[PDB]
Coordinates of C-alpha atoms and ligand atoms in Angstrom, one line a residue:
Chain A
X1 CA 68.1 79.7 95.9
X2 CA 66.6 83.0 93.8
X3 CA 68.4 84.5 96.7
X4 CA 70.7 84.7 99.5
X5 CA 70.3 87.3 102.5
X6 CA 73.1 87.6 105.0
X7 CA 72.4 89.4 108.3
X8 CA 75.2 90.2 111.0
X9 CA 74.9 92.2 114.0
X10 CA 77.5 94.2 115.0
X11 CA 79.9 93.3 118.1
X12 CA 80.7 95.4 121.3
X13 CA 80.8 99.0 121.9
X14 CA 82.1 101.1 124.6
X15 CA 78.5 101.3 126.4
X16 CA 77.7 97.5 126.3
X17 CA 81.0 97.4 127.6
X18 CA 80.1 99.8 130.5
X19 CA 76.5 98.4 130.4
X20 CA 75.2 101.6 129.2
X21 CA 71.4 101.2 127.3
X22 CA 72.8 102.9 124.0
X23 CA 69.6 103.4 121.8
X24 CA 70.1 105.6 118.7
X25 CA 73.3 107.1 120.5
X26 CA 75.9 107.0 118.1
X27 CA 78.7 105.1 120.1
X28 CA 81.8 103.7 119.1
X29 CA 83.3 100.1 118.5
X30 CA 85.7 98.7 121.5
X31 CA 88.8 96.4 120.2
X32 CA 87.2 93.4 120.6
X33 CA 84.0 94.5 118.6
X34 CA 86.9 95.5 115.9
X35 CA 87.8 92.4 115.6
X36 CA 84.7 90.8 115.9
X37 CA 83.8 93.1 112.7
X38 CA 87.7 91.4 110.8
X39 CA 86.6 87.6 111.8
X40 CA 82.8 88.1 110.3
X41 CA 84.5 89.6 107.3
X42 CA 86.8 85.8 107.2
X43 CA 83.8 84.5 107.6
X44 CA 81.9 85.2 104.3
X45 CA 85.6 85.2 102.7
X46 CA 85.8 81.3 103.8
X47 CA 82.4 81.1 102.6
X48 CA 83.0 82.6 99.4
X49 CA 79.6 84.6 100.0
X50 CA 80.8 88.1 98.7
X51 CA 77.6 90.5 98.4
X52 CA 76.3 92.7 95.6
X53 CA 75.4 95.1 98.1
X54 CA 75.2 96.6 101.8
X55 CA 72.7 98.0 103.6
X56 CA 72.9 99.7 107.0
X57 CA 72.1 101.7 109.3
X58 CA 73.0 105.1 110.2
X59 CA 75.1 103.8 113.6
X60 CA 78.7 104.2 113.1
X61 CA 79.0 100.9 115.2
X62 CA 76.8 99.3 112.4
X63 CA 78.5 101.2 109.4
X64 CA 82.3 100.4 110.4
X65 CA 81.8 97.2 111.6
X66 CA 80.6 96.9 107.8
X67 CA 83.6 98.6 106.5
X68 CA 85.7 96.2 108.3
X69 CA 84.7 92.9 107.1
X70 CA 84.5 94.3 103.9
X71 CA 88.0 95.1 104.4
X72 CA 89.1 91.8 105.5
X73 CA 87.1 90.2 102.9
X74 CA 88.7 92.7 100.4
X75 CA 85.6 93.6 98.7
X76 CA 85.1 97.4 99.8
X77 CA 84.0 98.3 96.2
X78 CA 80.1 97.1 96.1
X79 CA 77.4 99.9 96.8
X80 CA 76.3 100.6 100.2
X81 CA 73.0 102.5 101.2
X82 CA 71.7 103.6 104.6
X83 CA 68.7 104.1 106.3
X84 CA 68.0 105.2 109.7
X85 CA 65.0 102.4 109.3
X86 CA 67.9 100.1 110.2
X87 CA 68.9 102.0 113.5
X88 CA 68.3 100.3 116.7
X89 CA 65.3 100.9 118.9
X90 CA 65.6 104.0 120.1
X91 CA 65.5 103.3 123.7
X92 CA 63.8 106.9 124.9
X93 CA 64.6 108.5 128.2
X94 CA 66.8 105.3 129.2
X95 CA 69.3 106.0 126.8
X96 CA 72.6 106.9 128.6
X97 CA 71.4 104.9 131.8
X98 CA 71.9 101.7 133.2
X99 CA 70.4 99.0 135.3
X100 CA 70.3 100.7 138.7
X101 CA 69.7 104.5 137.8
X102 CA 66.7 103.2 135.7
X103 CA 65.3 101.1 138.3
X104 CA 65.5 104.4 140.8
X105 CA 64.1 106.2 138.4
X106 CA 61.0 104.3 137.2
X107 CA 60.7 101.6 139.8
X108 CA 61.4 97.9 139.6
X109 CA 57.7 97.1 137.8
X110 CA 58.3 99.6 134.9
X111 CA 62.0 99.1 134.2
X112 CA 60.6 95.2 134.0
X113 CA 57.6 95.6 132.0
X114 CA 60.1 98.0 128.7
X115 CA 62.9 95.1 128.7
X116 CA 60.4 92.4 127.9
X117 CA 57.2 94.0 126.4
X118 CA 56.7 93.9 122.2
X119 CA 54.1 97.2 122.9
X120 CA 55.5 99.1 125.4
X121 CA 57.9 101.6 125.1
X122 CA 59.9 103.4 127.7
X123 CA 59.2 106.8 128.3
X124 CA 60.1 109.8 125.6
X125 CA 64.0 111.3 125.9
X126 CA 63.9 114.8 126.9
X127 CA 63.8 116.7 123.3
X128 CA 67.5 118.8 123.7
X129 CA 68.8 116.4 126.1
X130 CA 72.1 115.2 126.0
X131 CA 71.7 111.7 124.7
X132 CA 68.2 112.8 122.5
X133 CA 68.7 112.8 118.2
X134 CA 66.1 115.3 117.8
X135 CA 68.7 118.1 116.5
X136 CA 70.5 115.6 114.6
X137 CA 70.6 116.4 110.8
X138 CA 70.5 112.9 109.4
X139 CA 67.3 112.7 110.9
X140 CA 65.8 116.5 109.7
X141 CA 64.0 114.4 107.6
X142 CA 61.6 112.2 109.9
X143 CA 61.3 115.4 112.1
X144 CA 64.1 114.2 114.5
X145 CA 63.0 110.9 114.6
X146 CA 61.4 109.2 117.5
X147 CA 61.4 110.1 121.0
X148 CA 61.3 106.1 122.4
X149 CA 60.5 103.2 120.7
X150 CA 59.2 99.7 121.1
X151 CA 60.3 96.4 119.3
X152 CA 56.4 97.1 117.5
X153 CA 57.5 100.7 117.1
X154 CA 61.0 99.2 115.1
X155 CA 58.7 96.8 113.2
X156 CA 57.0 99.7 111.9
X157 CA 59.3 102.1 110.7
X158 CA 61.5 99.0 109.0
X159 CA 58.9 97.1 107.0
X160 CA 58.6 99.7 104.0
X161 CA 62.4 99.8 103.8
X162 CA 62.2 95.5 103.5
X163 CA 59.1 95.7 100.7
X164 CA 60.3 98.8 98.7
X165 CA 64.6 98.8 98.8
X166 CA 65.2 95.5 100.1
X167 CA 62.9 93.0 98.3
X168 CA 63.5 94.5 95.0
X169 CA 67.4 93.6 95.4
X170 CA 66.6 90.1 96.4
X171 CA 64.5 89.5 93.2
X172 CA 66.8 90.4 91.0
X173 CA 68.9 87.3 92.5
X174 CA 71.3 89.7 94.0
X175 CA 72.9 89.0 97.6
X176 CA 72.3 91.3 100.0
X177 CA 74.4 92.2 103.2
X178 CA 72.5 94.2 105.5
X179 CA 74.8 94.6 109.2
X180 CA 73.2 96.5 111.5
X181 CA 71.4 96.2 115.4
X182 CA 70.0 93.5 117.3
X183 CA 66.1 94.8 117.5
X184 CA 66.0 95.8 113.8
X185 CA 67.3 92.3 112.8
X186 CA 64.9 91.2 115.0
X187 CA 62.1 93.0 113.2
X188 CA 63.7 91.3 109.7
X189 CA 64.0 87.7 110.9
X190 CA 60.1 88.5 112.3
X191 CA 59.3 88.9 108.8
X192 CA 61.2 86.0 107.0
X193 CA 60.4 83.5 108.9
X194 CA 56.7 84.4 110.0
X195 CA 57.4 84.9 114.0
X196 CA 54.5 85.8 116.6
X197 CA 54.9 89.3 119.1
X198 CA 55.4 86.4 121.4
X199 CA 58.4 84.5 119.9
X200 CA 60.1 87.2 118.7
X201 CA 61.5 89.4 121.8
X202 CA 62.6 86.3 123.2
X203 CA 64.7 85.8 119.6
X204 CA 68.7 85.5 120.3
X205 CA 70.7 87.7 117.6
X206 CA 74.2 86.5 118.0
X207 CA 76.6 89.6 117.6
X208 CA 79.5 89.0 115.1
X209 CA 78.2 86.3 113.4
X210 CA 76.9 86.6 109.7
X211 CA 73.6 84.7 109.3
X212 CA 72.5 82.8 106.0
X213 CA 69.1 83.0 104.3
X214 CA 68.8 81.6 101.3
X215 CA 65.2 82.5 100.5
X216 CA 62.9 80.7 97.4
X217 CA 61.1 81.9 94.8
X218 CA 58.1 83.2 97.1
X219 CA 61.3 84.8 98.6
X220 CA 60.3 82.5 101.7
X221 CA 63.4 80.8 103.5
X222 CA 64.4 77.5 102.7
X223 CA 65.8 76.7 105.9
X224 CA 63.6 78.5 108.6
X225 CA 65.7 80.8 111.3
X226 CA 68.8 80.7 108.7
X227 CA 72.0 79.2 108.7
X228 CA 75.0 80.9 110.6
X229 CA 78.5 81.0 108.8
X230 CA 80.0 79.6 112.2
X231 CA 77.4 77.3 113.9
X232 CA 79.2 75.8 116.5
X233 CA 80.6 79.9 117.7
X234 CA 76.8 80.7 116.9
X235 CA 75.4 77.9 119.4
X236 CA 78.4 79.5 122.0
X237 CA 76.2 82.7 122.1
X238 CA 72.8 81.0 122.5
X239 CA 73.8 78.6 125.4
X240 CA 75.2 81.1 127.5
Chain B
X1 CA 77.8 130.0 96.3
X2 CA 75.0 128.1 95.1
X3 CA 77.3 124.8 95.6
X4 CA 80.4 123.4 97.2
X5 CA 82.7 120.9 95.9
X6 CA 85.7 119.7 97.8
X7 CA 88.2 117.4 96.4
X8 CA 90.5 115.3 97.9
X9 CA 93.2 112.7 96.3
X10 CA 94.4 110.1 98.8
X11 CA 97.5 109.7 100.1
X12 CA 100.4 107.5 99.7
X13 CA 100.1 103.6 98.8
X14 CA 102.8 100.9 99.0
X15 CA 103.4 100.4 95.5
X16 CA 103.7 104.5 95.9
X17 CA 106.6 103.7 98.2
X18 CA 108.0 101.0 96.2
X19 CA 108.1 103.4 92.9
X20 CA 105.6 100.9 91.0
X21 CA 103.3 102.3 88.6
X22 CA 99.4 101.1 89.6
X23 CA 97.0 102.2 87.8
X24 CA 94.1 100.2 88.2
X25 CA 95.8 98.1 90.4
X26 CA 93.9 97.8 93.7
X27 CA 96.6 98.2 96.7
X28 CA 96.8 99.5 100.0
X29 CA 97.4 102.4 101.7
X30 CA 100.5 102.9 103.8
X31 CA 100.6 103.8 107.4
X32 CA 101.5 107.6 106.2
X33 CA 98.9 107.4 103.8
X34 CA 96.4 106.4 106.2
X35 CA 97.6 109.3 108.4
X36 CA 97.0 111.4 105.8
X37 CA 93.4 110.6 105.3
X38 CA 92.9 111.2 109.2
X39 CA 94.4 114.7 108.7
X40 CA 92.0 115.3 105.9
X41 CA 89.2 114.6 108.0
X42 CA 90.6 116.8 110.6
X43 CA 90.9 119.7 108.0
X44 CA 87.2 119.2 107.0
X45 CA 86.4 119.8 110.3
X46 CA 87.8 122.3 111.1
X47 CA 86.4 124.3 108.4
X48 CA 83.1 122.7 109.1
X49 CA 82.6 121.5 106.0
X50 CA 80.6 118.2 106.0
X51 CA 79.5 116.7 102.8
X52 CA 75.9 116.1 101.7
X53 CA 77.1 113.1 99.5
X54 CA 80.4 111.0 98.7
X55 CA 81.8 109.8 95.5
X56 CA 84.6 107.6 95.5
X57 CA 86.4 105.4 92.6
X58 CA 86.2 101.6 93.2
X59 CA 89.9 101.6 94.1
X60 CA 90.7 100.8 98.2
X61 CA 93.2 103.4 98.7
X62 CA 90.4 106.0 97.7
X63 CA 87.5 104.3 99.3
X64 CA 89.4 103.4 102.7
X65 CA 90.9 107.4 102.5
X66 CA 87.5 108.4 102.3
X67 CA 85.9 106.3 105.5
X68 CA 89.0 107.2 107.6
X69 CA 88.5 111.2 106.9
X70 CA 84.6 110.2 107.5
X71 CA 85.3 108.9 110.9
X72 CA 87.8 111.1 112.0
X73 CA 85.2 114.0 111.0
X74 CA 82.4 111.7 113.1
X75 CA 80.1 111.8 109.5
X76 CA 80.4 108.4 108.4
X77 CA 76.7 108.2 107.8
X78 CA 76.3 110.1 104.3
X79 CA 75.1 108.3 101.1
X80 CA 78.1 107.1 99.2
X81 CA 78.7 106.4 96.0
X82 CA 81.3 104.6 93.6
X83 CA 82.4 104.4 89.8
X84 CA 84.9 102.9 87.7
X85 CA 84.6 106.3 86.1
X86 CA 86.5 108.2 88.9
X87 CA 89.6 105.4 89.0
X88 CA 93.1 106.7 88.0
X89 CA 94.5 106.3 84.5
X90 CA 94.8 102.6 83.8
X91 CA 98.9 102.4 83.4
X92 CA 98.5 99.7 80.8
X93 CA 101.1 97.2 80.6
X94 CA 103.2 99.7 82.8
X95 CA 101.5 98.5 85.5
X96 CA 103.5 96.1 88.3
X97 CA 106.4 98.1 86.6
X98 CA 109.2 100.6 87.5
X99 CA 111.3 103.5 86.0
X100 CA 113.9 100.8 85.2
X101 CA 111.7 97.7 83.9
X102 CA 109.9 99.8 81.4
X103 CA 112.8 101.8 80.0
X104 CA 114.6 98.2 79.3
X105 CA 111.6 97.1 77.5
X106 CA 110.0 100.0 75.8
X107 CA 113.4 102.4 75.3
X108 CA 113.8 105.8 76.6
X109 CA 112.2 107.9 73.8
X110 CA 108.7 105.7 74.4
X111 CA 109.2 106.1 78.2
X112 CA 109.3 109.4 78.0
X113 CA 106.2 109.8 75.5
X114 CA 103.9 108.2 77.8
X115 CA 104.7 109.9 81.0
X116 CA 103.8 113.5 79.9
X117 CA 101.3 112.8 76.6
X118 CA 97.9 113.9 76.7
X119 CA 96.9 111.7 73.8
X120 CA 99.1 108.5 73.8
X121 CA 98.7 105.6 76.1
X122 CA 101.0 103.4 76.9
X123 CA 100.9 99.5 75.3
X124 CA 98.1 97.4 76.7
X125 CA 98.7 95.0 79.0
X126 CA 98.1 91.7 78.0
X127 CA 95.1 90.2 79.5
X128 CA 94.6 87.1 82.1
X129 CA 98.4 88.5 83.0
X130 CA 98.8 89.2 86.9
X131 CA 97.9 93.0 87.1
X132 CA 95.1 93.2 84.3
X133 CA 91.6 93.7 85.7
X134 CA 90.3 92.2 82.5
X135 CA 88.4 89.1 84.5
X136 CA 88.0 91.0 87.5
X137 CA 83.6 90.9 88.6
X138 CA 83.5 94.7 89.3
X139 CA 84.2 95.6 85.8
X140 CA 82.4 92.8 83.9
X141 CA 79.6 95.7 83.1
X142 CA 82.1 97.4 80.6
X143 CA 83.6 94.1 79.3
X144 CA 86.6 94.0 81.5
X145 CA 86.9 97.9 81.1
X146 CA 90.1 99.3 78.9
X147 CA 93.5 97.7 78.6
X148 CA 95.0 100.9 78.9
X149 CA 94.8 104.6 78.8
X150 CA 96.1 108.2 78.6
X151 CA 95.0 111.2 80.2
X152 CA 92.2 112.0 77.1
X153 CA 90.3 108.9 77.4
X154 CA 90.5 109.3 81.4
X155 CA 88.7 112.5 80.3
X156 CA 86.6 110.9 78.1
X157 CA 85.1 108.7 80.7
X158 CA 84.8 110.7 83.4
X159 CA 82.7 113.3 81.7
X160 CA 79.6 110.7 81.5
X161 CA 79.5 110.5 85.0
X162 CA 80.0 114.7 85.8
X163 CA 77.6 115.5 83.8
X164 CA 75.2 112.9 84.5
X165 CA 75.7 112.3 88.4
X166 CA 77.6 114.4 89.8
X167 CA 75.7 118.1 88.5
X168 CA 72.7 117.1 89.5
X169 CA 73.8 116.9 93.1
X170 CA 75.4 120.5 92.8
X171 CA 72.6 122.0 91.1
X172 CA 70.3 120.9 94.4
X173 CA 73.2 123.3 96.3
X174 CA 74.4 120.1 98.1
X175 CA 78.1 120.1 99.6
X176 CA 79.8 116.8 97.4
X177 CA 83.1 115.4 98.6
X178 CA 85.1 113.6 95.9
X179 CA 88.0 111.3 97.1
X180 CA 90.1 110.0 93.9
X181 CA 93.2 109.8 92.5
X182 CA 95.5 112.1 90.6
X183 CA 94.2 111.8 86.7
X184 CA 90.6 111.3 87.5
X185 CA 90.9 114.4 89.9
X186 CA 92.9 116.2 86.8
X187 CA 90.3 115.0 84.4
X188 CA 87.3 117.2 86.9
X189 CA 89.6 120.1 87.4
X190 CA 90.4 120.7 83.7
X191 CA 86.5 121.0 83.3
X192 CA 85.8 123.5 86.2
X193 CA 88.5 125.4 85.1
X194 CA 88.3 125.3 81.2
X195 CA 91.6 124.1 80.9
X196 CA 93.8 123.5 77.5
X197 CA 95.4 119.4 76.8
X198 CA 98.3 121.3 77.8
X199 CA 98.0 123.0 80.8
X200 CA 96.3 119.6 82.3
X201 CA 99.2 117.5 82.2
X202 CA 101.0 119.9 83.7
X203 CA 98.8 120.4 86.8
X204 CA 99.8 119.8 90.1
X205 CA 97.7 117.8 92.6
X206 CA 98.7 117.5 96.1
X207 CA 97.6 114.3 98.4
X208 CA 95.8 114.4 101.4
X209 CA 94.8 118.4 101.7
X210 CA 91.4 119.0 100.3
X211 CA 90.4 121.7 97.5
X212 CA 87.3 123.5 97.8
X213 CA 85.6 124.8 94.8
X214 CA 82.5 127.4 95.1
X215 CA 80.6 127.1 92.5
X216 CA 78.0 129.5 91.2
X217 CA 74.7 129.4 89.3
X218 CA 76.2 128.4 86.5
X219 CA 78.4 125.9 87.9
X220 CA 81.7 128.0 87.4
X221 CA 84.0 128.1 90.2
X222 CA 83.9 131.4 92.5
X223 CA 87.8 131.1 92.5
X224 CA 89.6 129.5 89.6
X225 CA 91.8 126.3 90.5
X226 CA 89.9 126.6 94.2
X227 CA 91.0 126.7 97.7
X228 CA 93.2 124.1 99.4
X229 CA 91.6 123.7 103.1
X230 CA 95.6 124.1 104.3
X231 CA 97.3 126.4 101.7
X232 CA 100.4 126.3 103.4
X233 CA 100.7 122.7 103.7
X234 CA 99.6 123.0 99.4
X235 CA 101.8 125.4 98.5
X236 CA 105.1 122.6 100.4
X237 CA 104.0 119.9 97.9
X238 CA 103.9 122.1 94.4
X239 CA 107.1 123.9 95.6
X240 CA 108.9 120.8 95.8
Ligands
CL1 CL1 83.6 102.8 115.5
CL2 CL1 93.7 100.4 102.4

């Protein structure tokens, strides 16, 4: 390969735990998404795939779940930069919910219609709110960022970070380690390997699991949806 | 002030706690030194004193001092970034050595020589040997880096990067946190405060209790030799 692109997701937190619809609300690692961070970070030791650089998001579950397998894989010196393009969806006035308190909320058609729809976000967080970003100063920038989002939205707002950071890094034959969320690695693996609206929410991200592009010249893959460091584990996720 | 600069060294290490002299050796932090970077974070909240930007050495003990403080403080998200050029004093062919081991092989009179000169380094450690970072990847840009040095050339090469990195991000009136290691710390603080060959050596650096410098227009500091965030706890290490 020109170049090789590795892609985890980070493991649990304490809201999947309590299946709580998280968003852009900076929640912590449990234990077992700790050490879901220390075996991903065996993992590209085994591999011998030790990365030039990381990228990720602003989420302290992304950004210590990075710090951990760099840890294990004892390679905590190589620059890291961050981008709140990376973040999540942010999941609008559903985050800090959960299954039954959104369904009473928004009815059963609604709450149906934002799991599974590319185009339609839920509705905007109250601005002030408990669980809303919009007084957070890492985002003072974008204006408090956005008040919900879409898996369209998340394609948006992390494209130019892919053409004007990313690609640049993968031309220059370095490899790149981005760890991060489950819809903006979505939005990434959209764009590698050429996905529809259609095929892509229905994409499974494995958590924990580092994922392999080796990408060409063209900076095209050249094995389509990647390779993962632990197949067999990686097939575990998808068949249940 | 125009600009804030805190410093903080990081606390203690196992070879630390086994007497060893490191250098450029990369080791671990001890349960107590961890402790003390969780304290440090404490103290920078407290004070409410969150960095704009982080600069760390490439050495673990600062860069995993500097993510526990983060996370304690809940600001892991800043940009970040590392240089060889803020490591501690490369200890030569003193380094995997003790008290004991280098007075055998060197004598007392050199011993003594290169543990309070300015200008003399101790012998160079042979490279390929065990603790040499000759062949190590995150110094192949500068040939391997230096087989040894005193505190002058730490000076030397530190400069480069205060001037050209680190100003800049003052001058834009930007809070900069600094988490290093005794010399390189040294090598900053005989700049801010104009100090003499002499006076440097001599200076006093405690772990794990952060140093606040306010700078002015011109860069000078507000109060000379700063403010420790605890100077109680500050003024227990240099009185013992
Ligand atoms: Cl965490
Ligand atoms: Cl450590």
């Amino acid at each position: 390969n020109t170049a090789t692109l590795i892609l985890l997701r980070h493991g649990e937190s304490d809201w999947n735990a309590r299946n709580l619809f998280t968003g852009w609300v900076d929640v912590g690692l449990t234990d077992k998404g700790r050490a879901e961070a220390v075996r991903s970070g065996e993992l590209l030791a085994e591999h011998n795939l030790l990365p030039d650089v990381l990228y990720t998001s602003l989420l302290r579950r992304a950004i210590t779940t990075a710090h951990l397998a760099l840890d294990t894989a004892d390679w905590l010196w190589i620059p890291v930069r961050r981008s709140w393009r990376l973040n999540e969806r942010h999941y609008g006035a559903l985050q800090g919910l959960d299954k039954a308190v959104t369904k009473a909320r928004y009815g059963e058609e609604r709450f149906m219609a934002w799991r599974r729809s590319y185009d339609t976000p839920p509705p905007p967080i109250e601005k002030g709110s408990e669980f809303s970003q919009d007084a957070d100063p890492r985002y003072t920038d974008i204006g408090g960022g956005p008040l919900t989002e879409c898996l369209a939205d998340v394609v948006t707002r992390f494209l130019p970070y892919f053409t004007d950071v990313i690609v640049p890094d993968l031309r220059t034959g370095r490899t790149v380690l981005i760890v991060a969320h489950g819809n903006s690695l979505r939005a990434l693996v959209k764009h590698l390997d050429e996905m529809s609206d259609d095929e892509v929410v229905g994409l499974n991200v494995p958590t924990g699991i580092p994922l392999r592009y080796d990408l060409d010249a063209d900076l095209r893959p050249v094995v389509p949806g990647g390779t993962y460091l632990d197949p067999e584990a990686a097939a575990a996720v998808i068949s249940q």
